[PDB]
Amino acid sequence: GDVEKGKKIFVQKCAQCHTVEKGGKHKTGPNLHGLFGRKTGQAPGFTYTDANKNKGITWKEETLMEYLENPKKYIPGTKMIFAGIKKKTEREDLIAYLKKATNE
Numbered sequence: 859g860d861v862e863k864g865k866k867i868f869v870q871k872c873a874q875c876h877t878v879e880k881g882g883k884h885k886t887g888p889n890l891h892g893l894f895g896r897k898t899g900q901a902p903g904f905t906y907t908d909a910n911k912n913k914g915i916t917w918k919e920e921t922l923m924e925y926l927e928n929p930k931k932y933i934p935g936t937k938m939i940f941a942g943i944k945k946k947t948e949r950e951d952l953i954a955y956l957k958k959a960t961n962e
């Protein structure tokens with residue numbers, strides 16, 4: 859994937875709702891401390907819907923690569939929406955970047 863690439867794709871589109879290199883808190887949006895890690899519903903104490911809260915999927919490509927296209931697509935029972943990096947190539951950059959971004 860890419861680091862500086864998805865580093866700009868992330869801080870440009872999911873930066874106000876997904877924190878990874880800034881801290882990983884539930885700021886205006888949920889951080890990515892659950893990305894590529896087997897666990898999806900990180901700390902449900904945030905506001906996940908009735909699925910990501912204590913979900914059971916993962917966040918590699920097909921899991922993210924799918925989500926990224928359209929949030930509700932992976933789980934329309936979610937409570938977030940944003941169709942920005944739905945293209946594809948850049949999408950991958952987003953994942954890889956994050957993989958080591960929130961690995962701080």
Ligand code: HEC
Pocket residue numbers: 871872874875876886887888890892893897898899900905906907910911917922925926929935936937938939940942943952
């Ligand atoms: C707020 C306006 C959001 C933006 C912008 C993006 N996401 Fe989102 N995402 C949001 C919420 C609130 C949730 C959790 C469900 C809920 O109802 O609270 C999510 C979920 C994800 C997930 C899965 C959750 C997990 O445990 O990992 C992923 C993988 C995810 N979001 C990715 C993602 C990306 C790549 C975004 C930018 C292209 C993005 N989200 C925007 C809130 C918001």
